[PDB]
Design a protein around this ligand. Sequence first.
Ligand code: F42
Ligand code: F42
Lengths: 326, 331
Amino acid sequence: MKFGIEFVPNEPIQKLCYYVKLAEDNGFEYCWITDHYNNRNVYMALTAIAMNTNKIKLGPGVTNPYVRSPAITASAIATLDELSGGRAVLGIGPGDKATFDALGIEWVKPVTTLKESIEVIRKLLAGERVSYEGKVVKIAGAALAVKPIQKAVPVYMGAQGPKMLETAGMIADGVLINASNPKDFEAAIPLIKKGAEAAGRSMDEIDVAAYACMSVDKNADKAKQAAVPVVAFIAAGSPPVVLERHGIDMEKVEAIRNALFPEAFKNVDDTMLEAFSIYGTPEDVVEKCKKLAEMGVTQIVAGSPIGPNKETAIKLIGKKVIPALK
Amino acid sequence: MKFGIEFVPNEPIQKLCYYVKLAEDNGFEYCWITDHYNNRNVYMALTAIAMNTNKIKLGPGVTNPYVRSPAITASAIATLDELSGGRAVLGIGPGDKATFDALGIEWVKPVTTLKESIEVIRKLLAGERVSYEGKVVKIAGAALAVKPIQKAVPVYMGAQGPKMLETAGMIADGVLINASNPKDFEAAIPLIKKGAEAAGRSMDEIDVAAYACMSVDKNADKAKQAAVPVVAFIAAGSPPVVLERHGIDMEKVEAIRNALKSGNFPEAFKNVDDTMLEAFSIYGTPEDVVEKCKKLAEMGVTQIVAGSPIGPNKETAIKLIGKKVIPALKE
Ligand SMILES: C[C@H](OP(=O)(O)OC[C@@H](O)[C@@H](O)[C@@H](O)Cn1c2nc(=O)[nH]c(=O)c-2cc2ccc(O)cc21)C(=O)N[C@@H](CCC(=O)N[C@@H](CCC(=O)O)C(=O)O)C(=O)O
Ligand SMILES: C[C@H](OP(=O)(O)OC[C@@H](O)[C@@H](O)[C@@H](O)Cn1c2nc(=O)[nH]c(=O)c-2cc2ccc(O)cc21)C(=O)N[C@@H](CCC(=O)N[C@@H](CCC(=O)O)C(=O)O)C(=O)O
């Protein structure tokens, strides 16, 4: 099993550089930084991370076709790959309606715009002159001067909806799914497989990644309790099909959505902690990851909280979780 | 053949970080930075270099037991290995009398000092609490809190003389020999092998490195011209044994010795001839240099250090070596 780590660049980048180097020392293989206009800029954070790291893969987790021209994205990814000596990965997704409303941006065909941005980004990274008259994305004679070091920078798609999961199976080198429980993947992987069989691809070409809420501590209950605030936020934002897949009292969920705080947090129960987070001792967490692996998951991203204390939990994971899971 | 690159940190450290990143891009595997009190500090240079690189191995080429405590050398190396994610190498040598006469440092038994220093550095790096009552190095209760990432950081000895070569066979993970010609390695690798056999070691455990003067250019004569000033210095400093081995006109040498002594660089270079260029440098076209490196591999060289001048232009030369030399010699 491969492990990733994710951070919002909402603290001074030096602190983030410490966490990621700590993650590299502890055998994490992927570093994913969120991209939102209100936080520190993702590529500037990835530059500093690159300079403080040596082996860990890194890149946006995830950017999108809208807040920058896909041409700019491609050139940013190439710069990162150059600087890091061939370690870049491109996490890319459609974004969200709240953002583009705020920014005055049209949320044009999410699935198509993404598919086509990705095809255009792959070609520019290959050093091709690109003339591409898509439905949404339209390029005329663009070329990069900057080159990546890798022949093909991996592209990981964020996908929650059915079409995106299938579109990912057809084009993506990997898929980031905001899920933490094996049932979420029993459903979504066939949807990716459908796309992958369609396009002639084996599932060996596709890193299915669990972008999970993790919370590991030496004390099971200290760990469980660190999970609670993120779990309460998940339950709120989940669509009913997920609510029905794991069997969640929409009663609590109206009480959590409403309370949102300590009232929101009080209504979080054990079926929700089962459903939206890998929590427990290292031995509990090692077991939950084993199960996700049987379901086709090849990367687990230890998202927030990483534990009650991120620093302590990164180290605990390095000592007692990563080596037990190959 | 693995390739290394050498650099004196005598320009702003950002310029050096560019050259090393460029060498990494171009497939060089080792970066060796000299350690002399008059230039930029070797470990501050290596720190910056580590932050601008990702996979090239890096270290001092070479430090010595005298200008810092060996315990300070150990923790500096551990700090480098931590920062770089496990890429450090410790190049270490006895230093030189001229420096320690300048600095008021007694050049005590260079071979026993070096062996004892290397042994203490390794025990320190292995995390041991160290009490060591050597003939020169005496340590009581010392222990590092800083830990390397590599279980064993490699130790490369710089070695020109036969007792230093023998010692390297017994204790070193690699040997940096300042020489560019197969005749030097014919003479030296038997000496290394004797120490290895005495210590019970295979020669697969030992990276024999030619710390060479290299000058490559699409134009062989331009390459040759660029190597002269460095060759002038190597001929001048060569011990007497080395110059007869290669048949250097010893009168052309003294003329080079006086000119550099006075700082008369143009007079020094006027006295360098083809015999010293073939003796003390690897020069010419990429095809020429590839052939010369194969003749070095034949004597038992497993790393070539593309030392100064690298080429007429360092930046151009690093790229040409990357494109036309390293791939040809890559097992
Ligand atoms: C757009 C939406 O896609 P979704 O897969 O359900 O959810 C998208 C999320 O993944 C998206 O919000 C991500 O960008 C969020 N995301 C982040 N978004 C950000 O931009 N920044 C972040 O840092 C970020 C982090 C993050 C981390 C992990 C991750 O797991 C995702 C991340 C959707 O509606 N998908 C539908 C497509 C429906 C649709 O849009 N149809 C249109 C277009 C179809 C076409 O024309 O091709 C139509 O009917 O015409 C589906 O899958 O069926
Ligand atoms: C001490 C001297 O050793 P040497 O092997 O000739 O030293 C030449 C170089 O290796 C040495 O000067 C290096 O430190 C110089 N050097 C630099 N030295 C620096 O300190 N900084 C540098 O950056 C540097 C760069 C460098 C790069 C490559 C390189 O290959 C050498 C480098 C010597 O005379 N050795 C003889 C005699 C050994 C000896 O001293 N025996 C004594 C001592 C006995 C005892 O100590 O126990 C005796 O028998 O009485 C021998 O090897 O046989």
